[PDB]
Amino acid sequence: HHKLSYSLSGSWRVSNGNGSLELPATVPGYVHSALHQHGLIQDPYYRFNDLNYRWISLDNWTYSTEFKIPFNLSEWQKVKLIFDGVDTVAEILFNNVTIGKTDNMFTGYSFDITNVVKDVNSLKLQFRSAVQYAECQSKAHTSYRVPPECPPVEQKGECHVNFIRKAQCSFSWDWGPSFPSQGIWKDVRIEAYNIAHLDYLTFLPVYDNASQAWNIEIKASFDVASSKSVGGQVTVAIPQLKTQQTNDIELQQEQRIVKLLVKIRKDVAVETWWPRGHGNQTGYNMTILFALDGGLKIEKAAKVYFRTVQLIEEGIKGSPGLSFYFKINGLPIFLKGSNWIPADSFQDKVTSDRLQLLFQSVVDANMNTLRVWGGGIYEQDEFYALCDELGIMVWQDFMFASALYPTEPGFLASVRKEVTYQVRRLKSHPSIIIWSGNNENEVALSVNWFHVNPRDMKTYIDDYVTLYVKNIRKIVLSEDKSRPFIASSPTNGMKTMEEGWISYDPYSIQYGDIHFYNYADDCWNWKIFPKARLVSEYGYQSWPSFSTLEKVSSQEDWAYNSRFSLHRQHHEDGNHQMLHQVKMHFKLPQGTDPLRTFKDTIYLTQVMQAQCIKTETEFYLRSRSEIVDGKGHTMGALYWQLNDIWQAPSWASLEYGGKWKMLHYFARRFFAPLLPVGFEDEGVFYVYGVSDLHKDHHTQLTVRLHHWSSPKPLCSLVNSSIVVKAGEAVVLFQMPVSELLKRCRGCTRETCVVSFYFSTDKELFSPTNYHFLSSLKDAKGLLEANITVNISQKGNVFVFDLETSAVAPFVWLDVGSIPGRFSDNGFLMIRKKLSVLFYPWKPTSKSELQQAFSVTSLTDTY
Ligand SMILES: *[C@@H]1O[C@H](CO[C@@H]2O[C@@H](C)[C@@H](O)[C@@H](O)[C@@H]2O)[C@@H](O[C@@H]2O[C@H](CO)[C@@H](O)[C@H](O)[C@H]2NC(C)=O)[C@H](O)[C@H]1NC(C)=O
Numbered sequence: 058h059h060k061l062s063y064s065l066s067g068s069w070r071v072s073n074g075n076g077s078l079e080l081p082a083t084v085p086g087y088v089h090s091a092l093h094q095h096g097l098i099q100d101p102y103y104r105f106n107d108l109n110y111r112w113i114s115l116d117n118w119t120y121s122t123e124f125k126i127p128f129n130l131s132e133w134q135k136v137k138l139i140f141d142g143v144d145t146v147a148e149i150l151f152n153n154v155t156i157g158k159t160d161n162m163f164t165g166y167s168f169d170i171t172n173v174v175k176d177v178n179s180l181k182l183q184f185r186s187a188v189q190y191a192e193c194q195s196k197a198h199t200s201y202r203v204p205p206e207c208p209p210v211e212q213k214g215e216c217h218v219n220f221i222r223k224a225q226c227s228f229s230w231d232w233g234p235s236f237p238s239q240g241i242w243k244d245v246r247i248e249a250y251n252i253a254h255l256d257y258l259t260f261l262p263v264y265d266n267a268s269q270a271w272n273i274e275i276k277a278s279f280d281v282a283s284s285k286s287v288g289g290q291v292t293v294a295i296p297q298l299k300t301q302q303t304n305d306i307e308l309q310q311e312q313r314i315v316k317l318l319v320k321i322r323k324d325v326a327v328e329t330w331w332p333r334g335h336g337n338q339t340g341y342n343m344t345i346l347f348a349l350d351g352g353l354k355i356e357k358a359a360k361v362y363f364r365t366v367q368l369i370e371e372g373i374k375g376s377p378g379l380s381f382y383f384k385i386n387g388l389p390i391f392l393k394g395s396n397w398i399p400a401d402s403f404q405d406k407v408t409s410d411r412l413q414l415l416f417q418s419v420v421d422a423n424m425n426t427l428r429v430w431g432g433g434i435y436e437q438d439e440f441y442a443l444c445d446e447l448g449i450m451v452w453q454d455f456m457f458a459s460a461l462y463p464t465e466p467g468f469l470a471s472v473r474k475e476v477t478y479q480v481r482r483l484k485s486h487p488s489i490i491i492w493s494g495n496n497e498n499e500v501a502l503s504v505n506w507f508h509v510n511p512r513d514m515k516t517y518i519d520d521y522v523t524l525y526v527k528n529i530r531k532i533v534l535s536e537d538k539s540r541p542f543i544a545s546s547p548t549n550g551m552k553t554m555e556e557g558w559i560s561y562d563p564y565s566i567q568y569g570d571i572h573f574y575n576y577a578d579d580c581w582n583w584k585i586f587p588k589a590r591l592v593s594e595y596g597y598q599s600w601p602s603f604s605t606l607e608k609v610s611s612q613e614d615w616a617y618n619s620r621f622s623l624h625r626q627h628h629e630d631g632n633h634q635m636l637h638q639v640k641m642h643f644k645l646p647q648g649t650d651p652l653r654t655f656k657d658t659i660y661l662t663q664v665m666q667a668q669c670i671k672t673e674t675e676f677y678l679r680s681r682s683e684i685v686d687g688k689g690h691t692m693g694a695l696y697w698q699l700n701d702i703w704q705a706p707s708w709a710s711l712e713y714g715g716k717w718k719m720l721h722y723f724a725r726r727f728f729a730p731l732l733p734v735g736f737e738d739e740g741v742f743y744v745y746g747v748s749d750l751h752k753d754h755h756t757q758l759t760v761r762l763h764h765w766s767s768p769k770p771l772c773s774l775v776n777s778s779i780v781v782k783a784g785e786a787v788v789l790f791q792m793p794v795s796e797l798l799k800r801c802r803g804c805t806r807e808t809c810v811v812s813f814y815f816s817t818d819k820e821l822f823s824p825t826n827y828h829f830l831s832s833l834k835d836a837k838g839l840l841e842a843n844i845t846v847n848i849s850q851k852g853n854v855f856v857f858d859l860e861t862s863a864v865a866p867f868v869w870l871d872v873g874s875i876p877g878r879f880s881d882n883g884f885l886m887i888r889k890k891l892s893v894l895f896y897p898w899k900p901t902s903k904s905e906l907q908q909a910f911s912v913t914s915l916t917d918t919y
């Protein structure tokens with residue numbers, strides 16, 4: 058009865074520095090999106106507007122609103138103004154009184170406005186340019202430089218992002234633009250109360266190996282209205298666990314924290330939470346009721362999920378060092394997923410509908426893990442709710458990435474609030490399986506990426522320990538010991554800590570995790586890849602589809618090396634690197650029409666990307682059970698990257714807008730729970746079996762060769778004594794290449810293709826796989842394919858019946874910007890006739906699909 062809360066989200070005003078511009082502005086919102094919405098600017102993502110609209114990011118904008126409170130001041134002891142998120146630096150004026158300032162995008166702010174609030178009020182947030190602010194802070198830091206000061210020229214970005222607590226990629230990245238905007242990016246509320254006010258509540262389900270029982274630690278902080286002592290009770294209730302518990306509490310200005318420990322009666326069984334493909338995502342409804350002196354009731358509901366996570370760094374026989382793998386509820390689980398980056402330059406456009414769609418694509422790719430990479434944001438509430446409900450594990454970076462950071466007291470003060478706020482906000486989600494202090498900054502110092510003078514290295518080392526160990530780690534462990542903490546990615550884990558927090562070689566495959574990139578060598582040669590304990594990053598670049606590019610480009614831009622394309626490419630020499638890897642096994646597009654060449658080159662970079670990451674992922678998949686030359690037991694593959702922040706060449710499998718690249722289709726296939734993977738070593742074709750299943754599985758391995766001439770198997774080897782143990786990888790086939798060809802007369806490396814598959818239940822997804830005996834640019838007898846398609850509707854799905862004149866590799870179906878994705882794409886089409894489905898994301902029609910449809914195969918490019 059003594060509490061009142063309502064949102065100030067809605068229609069505000071926004072105005073620029075000198076007041077010339079003034080327009081309506083939605084909150085939550087950003088200046089750029091307000092200007093675009095009001096028709097005052099073009100789409101910022103159009104062509105070169107990241108350069109043309111620089112002035113927006115450099116001015117100082119003010120968000121203003123006038124409102125009439127819906128309550129009587131004289132009836133309330135205290136009134137507060139609460140911000141869930143402000144981006145980033147702003148002075149806050151309430152009725153022309155400065156009530157506070159902000160400097161951190163990732164922390165909530167609370168301001169007492171009891172003495173300044175009136176019946177009619179004016180609220181102004183006077184933002185400061187993030188770019189200008191970051192530069193001034195860099196200047197003030199005279200005692201020494203903090204690198205990197207400016208980004209590479211090919212990123213077309215802004216300097217000194219490490220000096221502002223804001224999304225570190227907002228000043229540009231090697232796949233993202235520089236639109237460092239200003240805005241109120243989360244909800245704003247007025248909250249009045251008597252007696253007490255719940256500042257925050259956090260909880261943590263833990264398992265006591267001692268008691269063999271489940272508990273829930275709860276912590277709540279209150280702001281008490283007066284100097285008197287508030288009493289009351291608290292009842293925590295979980296009905297579906299026959300659990301209920303009531304305790305006495307008392308609150309005072311200097312004793313404002315409540316701590317409870319609810320024990321779950323062992324009489325009842327507690328179903329645990331599991332990642333997708335390894336169990337149920339079951340949780341339990343919970344309520345927390347505060348009944349305080351004077352009729353004040355404060356209830357909070359939450360969903361409780363019970364699961365245990367262990368980072369196991371144990372010894373391995375014959376493999377020097379330590380393992381690095383995750384046990385969920387005691388079961389070792391191979392991490393399968395990708396790295397998540399911000400889905401937009403402006404967070405107000407990452408709607409619930411976009412997110413749910415993106416998580417459907419993550420699910421349909423047979424992923425169970427996402428890394429929230431530390432150059433993005435601490436993600437919005439619904440991200441982690443979706444992870445919990447769908448069973449996606451989260452590798453959670455803190456928002457520090459590929460940079461050194463100051464330890465000036467004001468900055469550290471800012472960081473402490475942020476980390477404290479976010480850990481309390483996030484620690485109750487079962488999806489989060491590990492805390493990670495930063496991205497790649499242990500490497501940056503160990504290798505001296507920024508070429509610091511070895512005379513000043515000690516300064517930066519101490520700054521590193523100060524930030525990630527003495528502040529971030531200390532805060533995390535003081536809140537949460539249910540999860541492992543690493544200081545950086547990649548790291549050597551316990552070995553890094555032993556070595557003083559900056560390892561001698563953080564890229565060691567004998568400890569911790571690694572990131573691995575390589576653009577020079579043949580991606581088909583799996584020997585280039587490290588047989589590491591866990592691969593948290595690895596990627597190849599490709600261009601997004603023409604449909605995605607068309608929306609932010611014009612006719613004259615549609616060439617691989619046009620001014621526009623080189624502008625969007627933010628990775629040093631990425632266009633050449635991508636072609637270099639294409640040439641490795643494919644013919645470059647030869648054609649007369651430049652637009653056709655443009656589209657065909659895109660297709661080939663997505664072909665190169667998909668096949669490269671397929672080869673690389675499968676290598677990690679097969680290395681999970683074996684040791685070879687003292688290396689192995691790979692227990693995770695998270696490729697860089699899942700998604701795009703805008704239309705540009707990147708490592709993503711999901712183009713900006715959600716459209717699947719060919720990589721994503723390959724991802725759905727190589728992340729299956731049961732998979733045969735083929736490769737060669739010194740002239741011997743091998744086939745391992747890979748299992749994520751919990752029971753040993755017995756199946757039948759068929760192997761076949763096919764001449765490019767027609768889909769007739771020149772042989773059919775069928776071992777039916779196949780057993781893959783639970784969650785393991787094991788060699789199931791082995792033969793010389795000469796012996797393999799002779800047993801299939803009429804086959805050359807340059808004329809035949811290998812194919813293999815298991816025979817599965819209809820309740821188990823184990824797709825076809827294949828292997829190429831030579832570069833396709835050298836394939837002989839490759840008949841020119843001529844594929845015919847008949848489109849039809851069946852319920853909410855559309856059916857695509859195909860027919861090919863020849864064995865067509867990398868058949869690619871494309872319906873432009875029609876929102877949706879196919880049941881399968883980019884596949885090797887041995888058969889003559891196949892059928893795939895199309896899943897629309899908005900209502901479409903067979904006519905629309907026919908008009909936009911196009912099919913491509915490898916031979917169409919030369
Ligand atoms: C590429 O294919 C089309 C369609 O070929 C048909 O489908 C095949 C699977 C097979 O059933 C063939 O017998 C069919 O012809 C070709 O278009 C056809 O061209 C012929 C003349 O050669 C004509 O009589 C048909 O009416 C056409 N059919 C359609 C649907 O248009 C086409 O010529 C093929 N070749 C090239 C270079 O495009």
Ligand SMILES: *[C@@H]1O[C@H](CO)[C@@H](O[C@@H]2O[C@H](CO)[C@@H](O)[C@H](O)[C@H]2NC(C)=O)[C@H](O)[C@H]1NC(C)=O
Binds near residue numbers: 297342
């Ligand atoms: C746990 O709480 C949720 C509500 O948050 C319950 O789900 C609701 O179920 C009703 C009908 O059963 C629906 O009308 C609502 O739309 C649901 N809400 C949501 C948010 O999904 C759920 O049934 C509860 N479980 C138990 C065992 O009580």
Ligand SMILES: *[C@@H]1O[C@H](CO[C@@H]2O[C@@H](C)[C@@H](O)[C@@H](O)[C@@H]2O)[C@@H](O)[C@H](O)[C@H]1NC(C)=O
Binds near residue numbers: 150153154155156
């Ligand atoms: C607003 O108030 C000014 C004096 O108050 C001081 O400045 C403002 C901007 C706040 O920061 C407040 O905390 C300070 O104490 C006046 O100089 C100014 O004329 C006033 N403006 C109007 C329109 O009334």
Ligand SMILES: *[C@@H]1O[C@H](CO)[C@@H](O)[C@H](O)[C@H]1NC(C)=O
Binds near residue numbers: 075077112
């Ligand atoms: C405000 O600054 C802009 C610069 O972007 C300028 O075009 C405009 O004329 C200025 N208006 C006033 C009133 O000074």
Ligand SMILES: *[C@@H]1O[C@H](CO)[C@@H](O)[C@H](O)[C@H]1NC(C)=O
Binds near residue numbers: 116186189
């Ligand atoms: C923005 O504000 C800062 C600090 O108040 C000031 O130094 C800078 O000149 C302002 N920029 C513009 C474009 O008005």
Ligand SMILES: *[C@@H]1O[C@H](CO)[C@@H](O)[C@H](O)[C@H]1NC(C)=O
Binds near residue numbers: 328336337
């Ligand atoms: C998981 O959920 C299924 C429903 O599909 C249920 O029947 C089963 O009992 C659950 N398994 C466990 C181990 O709780």
Ligand SMILES: [Ca+2]
Binds near residue numbers: 562563567568570
């Ligand atoms: Ca390592």
